[PDB]
């Protein structure tokens, strides 16, 4: 602390000098600026009787009333520059304090434009004039005549930090160049190195690497003129090596760059407890993600394992690992008010600059995190980060950053398919843009000096706004306008790059123009190209849209691996374009009753391009399209691809959660990391990374359980397709995979999925009818339709392939025909004579029907119409009522759109135990946890005295409480809450301490227990959540599902019983009472799935409130 000292001593000079003389007023102004410096970060008013702004305003008036001696001009320049600088700092601190007070009053997004937006034109001019004065001081050959050039250097550092916060990197570059000049003239070799490194860092973040390399060696040269033992030398050398690693990552020298990065990481210096190193760790953690975004072809395998060994599995983790360190540094420096609305600054020179630097780095890291997370498919997390950034920017009242964090939110809202909120956000931005300078920033000259056009950040904001506006145009159905907006984006990006290049040359004064153009706007161009190609797909008539595909392909391939996921999207578009009978049928062994060769190779290339960090939708479309083009040509490959196309965002979230688990430093954890890692495999051709990695995973199924996948094969990215893929994976069982096209039948795969939505809307409409006659008519007219639908799935979609779902007969009885019906079927016309399709069906041979046999024969046997059926029919007839089936639990896996259809009541899967897991790696991680003494429910059983209930959290449902009061209270050894909303501690305890959680209320209790609290605990209790849509993964657009179930399963929940659609009171109460008495009265060792299959017949409408409960997980039972 230096407060009282400087306070008293500055007062001494305040009273020690007169004012009438020209020197006196000057001295008083300097004394007033030093007084403002103290009053700006210390509370002494009561003892000073002056405010920071009043003091600095008086100092400015006095300073503008001074005439120099023609030899002290420089000192007046410096004093005026510092006075303006501290006016800006004190005004900004007043803004921050009143913003904190505003959040104190209110404890939004309408104040985004409420910013006075009238001071931003004077406050910026303060800093502009300060820079002008300091430049005029420090752009001349003669040595500056200022008394103290150290203070000038420090003030230039603070100017650079503030200019970085306000999103003006261009002027921060000039400030840092003047800092380098001051450093060289003052003969301090540490500050020159520090300055040179920031000049490189800023230059590479913009995207010009040549000048970045020039400055890195300029820094390397300065690194020699200083002692080789101090902390300064270690930190500067480590920073120089890290920048070299990043440069090699940019200059296609990854092989040596990774070695430099390994040296950087392994050096114990980046562990010592210091704020300078705490900042250095952020840069290395960002660089680890630049490497982790690389494909598996631009490196060796040993370097990849070396990089992953220390940590940082998927790129997303590294960036969250950074934003945490940045927030921790903020808490260390500026207290905690600026981050949450729930410490003294301690200014000693370094702290002042570090404060603004850490704020700027927080904002930049949040920007990168939002972009990357939204790209993968985690839109919710991106929105969370965006809202945090918007709050921080609103507190500081910086319009440009609010604009970037507003266009990001608009893009995410478009991703979630919410047009109104997206339009509002895009309109909030046109206000900010208008203040900064129908869209009016368009029609500008390619070259101009507009604030929205001379600043790269504002140009990027405008381009992203136009891109999202084009997207919202296309989504609303109003095309043409959206396509033109996308053309504007595609045209504008290169010219913006050209202007940034010219600006960089103007600032840095290098002779030769940049060898490499900036790559900051390349992502915008790639996304625009993707949108144009996708639009061209649905309009094949146009040829300009067709040629766009090639243009985007050259654009993405010309910069490898800078834009890999866009290359994968364009490759999938290219393959689906070359697609349009289907060539797929010649790749499986059945049909309903070359170009492909190159297509499969291109899909293989795209798979490699994104396998390590795949976007969800893109991967799912690719994997299943590759399965279509492959079929039974390589059954293992087809099974791998099909099972690699379901629940990908689930796997991203599980890897991130696992990293958090390990951070809060075990063997099961490590093996689970290896299982979920997108790169844990040996290198090689296609099989080694694909078919092999697959087989390595496929040799892991628990013996006695069938794992089927029902993936709806698409036809065009975005819409529901009319092809369905089925893969029966089992131990010692070669993959049996086929197609079930329903686009040639009467009940197409979209008819069922639209009738489901029609029934849902009818239910929502009838929910508010008073007349008993009208209400009951509607319920009884919807139950019949749902009953019709559940049988459509068995009658039309699965067709002659329900045996592949029913437990296959592992008895030695199929063998008699598994080769008998090949020696004639292949002769009659079979193209690919598979051998497993004749053993997966023999179980329940009596249940096999002659019309089933007809399709099974025609598809297996084309050409000659007589033998084709006759042989298969007589053979199957001879094998009728052969044997009885065993017990084999089933874990059906369904895609994002096939999860909502009731697949459990299908009149073939009624008796058998059927559940539903997100994916296959989940099924095997269940065995890992089940072997390392974890998940005690699957080890011992569900203790009937370890159940917790939450009934009627809000006093709304009197019928429920009336029914389940004594029954839920008299139960031996149970505890719960009725009437009152349970406190958070209590509910977390239930899922963690007990074994069963019966919820009777609205929804899933996302009001008293959100998925966030559930992920932050381990689930030891089976979830029986009986409320509307309690297990429904809402498909809010093209995005995958979302709900509480996908976060109970990540906590280790054995089973999860929740309703799929909305339910009323009495029927679901009947279901709950039936299931509970059935399961808790059966006795020890009683499967839950069996009694659910029984309780389905309790509701009055046995198809609209009886077929709703589904199960997620592995079989549970009593002890």
């Amino acid at each position: 602390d230096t407060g009282q000292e400087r306070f008293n001593i500055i007062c001494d000079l305040l009273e020690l000098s007169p004012e009438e003389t020209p020197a006196g007023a000057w001295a008083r102004a300097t004394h007033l600026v030093e007084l403002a410096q103290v009053l700006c970060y210390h509370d002494f008013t009561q003892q000073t009787n002056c405010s920071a702004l009043d003091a600095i305003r008086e100092a400015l008036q006095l300073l503008d009333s001074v005439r120099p001696e023609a030899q002290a001009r420089d000192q007046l320049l410096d004093d005026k520059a510092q006075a303006l600088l501290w006016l800006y700092i004190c005004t900004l601190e007043a803004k921050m304090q009143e913003g904190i007070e505003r959040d104190r009053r209110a404890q939004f997004l309408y104040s985004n434009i409420a910013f006075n937006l009238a001071a931003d034109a004077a406050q910026s001019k303060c800093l502009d004039q300060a820079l002008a004065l300091w430049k005029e001081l420090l752009t001349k050959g003669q040595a500056p005549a200022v008394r103290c050039l150290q203070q000038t250097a420090a003030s230039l550092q603070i100017l650079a930090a503030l200019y970085q916060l306000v999103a003006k990197p261009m002027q921060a570059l000039e400030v840092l160049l003047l800092l380098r000049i001051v450093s060289e003239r003052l003969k301090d070799h540490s500050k020159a190195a520090g300055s040179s490194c920031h000049i490189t860092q800023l230059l590479l973040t913009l995207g010009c690497p040549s000048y970045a390399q020039l400055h890195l060696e300029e820094a390397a040269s300065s690194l020699k003129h200083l002692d080789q033992t101090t902390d300064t030398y270690l930190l500067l050398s480590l920073t120089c090596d890290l920048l070299r690693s990043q440069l090699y990552w940019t200059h296609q020298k990854v092989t040596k760059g990774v070695s430099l990065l390994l040296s950087v990481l392994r050096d114990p210096a980046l562990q010592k407890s210091s704020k300078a190193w705490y900042l250095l760790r952020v840069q290395v953690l960002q660089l680890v993600a630049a490497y982790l975004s690389l494909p598996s072809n631009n490196l060796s395998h040993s370097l990849w394992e070396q990089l992953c060994a220390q940590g940082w599995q998927t790129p997303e983790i590294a960036l969250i690992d950074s934003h945490k360190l940045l927030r921790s540094i903020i808490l260390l420096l500026m207290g905690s008010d600026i981050l949450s609305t729930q410490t003294s600054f301690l200014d000693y020179g370094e702290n002042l600059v570090q404060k603004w630097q850490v704020l700027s780095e927080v904002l930049s890291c949040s920007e990168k995190l939002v972009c990357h997370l939204g790209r993968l498919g985690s839109v919710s997390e991106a929105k969370a980060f965006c809202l945090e950034a918007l709050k921080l920017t609103t507190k500081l009242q910086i319009p440009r950053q609010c604009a970037l964090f507003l266009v990001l939110k608009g893009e995410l809202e478009l991703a979630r398919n919410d047009i109104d909120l997206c339009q509002s956000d895009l309109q909030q931005v046109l206000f900010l843009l208008e203040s900064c300078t129908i869209p009016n920033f368009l029609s500008h000259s390619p070259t101009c000096d507009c604030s929205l056009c001379a600043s790269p950040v504002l140009t990027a904001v405008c381009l992203r706004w136009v891109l999202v506006t084009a997207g919202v145009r296309l989504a609303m159905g109003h095309q043409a306008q959206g396509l033109d907006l996308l053309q504007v984006v595609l045209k504008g990006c290169p010219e913006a790059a050209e202007r940034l290049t010219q600006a960089l040359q103007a600032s840095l004064n290098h002779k030769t123009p940049p060898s490499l153009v900036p790559s900051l706007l390349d992502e915008i161009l790639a996304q625009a190209y993707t949108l144009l190609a996708l639009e061209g797909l649905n309009q094949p008539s146009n040829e300009s849209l067709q040629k766009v595909l090639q243009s985007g392909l050259k654009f993405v391939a010309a910069r490898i691996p800078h834009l890999e996921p866009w290359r994968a999207s364009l490759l999938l578009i290219w393959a689906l374009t070359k697609l349009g009978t289907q060539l797929f049928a010649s790749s499986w062994g059945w049909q309903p009753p070359s170009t492909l060769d190159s297509i499969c190779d291109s899909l293989s290339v795209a798979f490699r391009g994104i396998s390590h960090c795949p976007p969800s939708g893109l991967y799912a479309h690719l994997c299943r399209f590759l399965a279509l083009c492959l079929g039974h040509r390589d059954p293992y490959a087809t099974a791998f691809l099909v099972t690699e196309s379901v629940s990908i965002t689930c796997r991203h979230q599980l890897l991130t959660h696992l990293h958090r688990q390990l951070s809060k430093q075990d063997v099961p954890l490590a093996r689970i990391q290896r299982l979920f890692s997108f790169r844990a495999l040996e290198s090689g051709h296609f099989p080694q990374p694909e078919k092999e990695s697959f087989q390595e995973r496929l040799a892991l199924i628990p013996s006695g359980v069938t794992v089927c996948v029902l993936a709806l094969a698409t036809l065009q990215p975005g819409t529901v397709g009319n092809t369905l893929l089925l893969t029966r994976l089992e131990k010692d069982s070669p993959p049996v995979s086929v197609q079930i096209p329903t686009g040639q039948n009467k009940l197409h795969l979209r008819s069922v999925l639209n009738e489901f939505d029609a029934i849902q809307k009818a239910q929502k409409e009838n929910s508010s009818c008073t007349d008993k006659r009208e209400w009951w008519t509607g319920r009884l007219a919807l139950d019949h339709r749902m009953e019709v639908l559940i049988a459509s799935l068995e009658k039309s979609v699965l067709g002659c392939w329900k045996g592949l779902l029913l437990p296959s007969s592992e008895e030695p009885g199929p063998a008699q025909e598994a080769s008998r019906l090949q020696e004639l079927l292949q002769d009659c016309g079979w193209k690919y004579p598979d051998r497993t399709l004749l053993k997966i069906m023999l179980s329940g041979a009596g249940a096999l029907t002659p019309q089933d046999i007809q399709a099974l024969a025609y598809g297996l046997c084309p050409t000659q119409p007589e033998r084709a059926q006759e042989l298969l029919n007589e053979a199957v007839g001879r094998l009728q009522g052969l044997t009885v089936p065993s017990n084999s639990h089933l874990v059906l896996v369904l895609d994002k759109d096939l999860q909502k259809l009731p697949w459990e009541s299908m009149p073939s899967l009624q008796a058998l135990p059927v559940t539903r897991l997100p994916s296959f790696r989940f099924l095997l991680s269940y065995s890992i946890i089940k072997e390392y003494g974890a998940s005690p429910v699957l080890s011992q059983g569900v203790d009937p005295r370890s159940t917790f209930y939450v009934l009627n959290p809000h006093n709304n449902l009197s019928s429920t409480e009336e029914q389940f009061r004594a029954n839920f209270s008299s139960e031996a050894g149970w505890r719960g809450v009725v009437g009152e909303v349970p406190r958070p501690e209590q509910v977390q305890e239930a899922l963690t301490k007990h074994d069963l959680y019966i919820y009777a209320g609205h929804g899933a209790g996302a009001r008293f227990l959100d998925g966030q609290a559930v992920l932050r605990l381990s689930c030891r209790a089976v979830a029986l959540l009986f409320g509307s849509s309690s297990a429904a993964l809402a498909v809010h657009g093209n995005l995958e599902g979302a709900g509480i179930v996908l976060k109970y399963i990540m906590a280790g929940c054995p089973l999860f019983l929740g309703n799929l659609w909305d339910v009323t009171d009495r029927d679901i109460d009947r279901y709950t009472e039936a299931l509970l008495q059935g399961w808790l009265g059966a006795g020890p060792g009683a499967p839950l799935l069996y009694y659910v299959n029984q309780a389905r017949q309790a509701p009055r409408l046995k198809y609209l409130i009886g077929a709703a409960p589904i199960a997620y997980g592995l079989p549970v039972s009593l002890r």
Partner: peptide
């Protein structure tokens, strides 16, 4: 039709729908 029979049916029900990391402390330099 069935209007007189629907009189004996019970009154309509009600739906079961509402229809409505901490930054760490780094060691000081």
């Amino acid at each position: 039709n069935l209007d007189e029979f629907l009189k004996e049916f019970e009154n309509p029900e009600v739906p079961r729908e509402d229809q409505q990391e901490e930054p760490s402390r780094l060691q000081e330099s």
